[PDB]
Each structure stands twice: as structure tokens, then as C-alpha cells.
Amino acid sequence: GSDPESSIFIEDAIKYFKEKVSTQNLLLLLTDNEAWNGFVAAAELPRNEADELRKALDNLARQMIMKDKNWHDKGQQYRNWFLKEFPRLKSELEDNIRRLRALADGVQKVHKGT
Numbered sequence: 001g002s003d004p005e006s007s008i009f010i011e012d013a014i015k016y017f018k019e020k021v022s023t024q025n026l027l028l029l030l031t032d033n034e035a036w037n038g039f040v041a042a043a044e045l046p047r048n049e050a051d052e053l054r055k056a057l058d059n060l061a062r063q064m065i066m067k068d069k070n071w072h073d074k075g076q077q078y079r080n081w082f083l084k085e086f087p088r089l090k091s092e093l094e095d096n097i098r099r100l101r102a103l104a105d106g107v108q109k110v111h112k113g114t
Contacts, residue, residue: 001108
């Protein structure tokens with residue numbers, strides 16, 4: 001009754017990243033540092049959950065990196081950033097994650113949002 005509830009947000013965000021988002025798509029968010037910060041800095045997430053998210057996704061990635069060199073194979077998920085950020089923007093990944101975060105606060109309300 002005086003907690004951030006980051007853990008709930010992490011597990012339920014990983015559900016959004018595994019069920020709603022493809023693994024091959026989230027690995028391209030993880031591989032590039034500016035892409036991940038483009039998500040987190042937009043979502044304004046504290047370093048605690050900011051890391052716990054990518055670390056939980058890095059356990060999903062931990063089993064992959066043993067055989068997959070796809071991380072630096074060619075680097076071209078798409079030929080342009082326009083082609084990447086057009087079906088959905090990094091602010092949409094942020095939006096859906098801010099929903100999950102404010103739902104964690106929706107249970108707790110110690111972090112005085114509204």
C-alpha cells in the first residue's frame with residue numbers, strides 16, 4: 001500500500017510484447033539503443049522498470065542469441081526509418097505501455113497521478 005507496482009507492469013507488458021507484438025519485431029527494439037530510449041523516454045519510465053522490461057525481454061532473447069546472429073546480420077528490418085515507423089510509431093508502443101503503467105497505478109494510486 002506504498003509501492004510503485006513496477007513488477008505487475010513488467011510481466012503484463014511482456015504479455016503485450018509476446019502475444020500482441022512479434023518476437024522478431026521486439027528484438028529490433030532491443031538491438032538498437034536509440035530505439036529502446038525512443039520508447040522509454042517517451043513513456044517517461046524510471047530506470048527500475050525501464051531496465052526490468054528489456055531484461056525480461058532479454059530472457060526471451062537469451063535463448064535466441066545462442067543460435068541467432070540476426071541482431072547484426074544486415075541490420076535492415078526495413079530500408080528506411082519511414083518504412084519502420086509508419087504501420088505503428090514508437091509513441092504507440094509508449095501509449096499502450098503507459099496504459100499498462102496507469103492500470104498498475106489504477107490498482108495502487110500511491111504514485112499520485114489522478
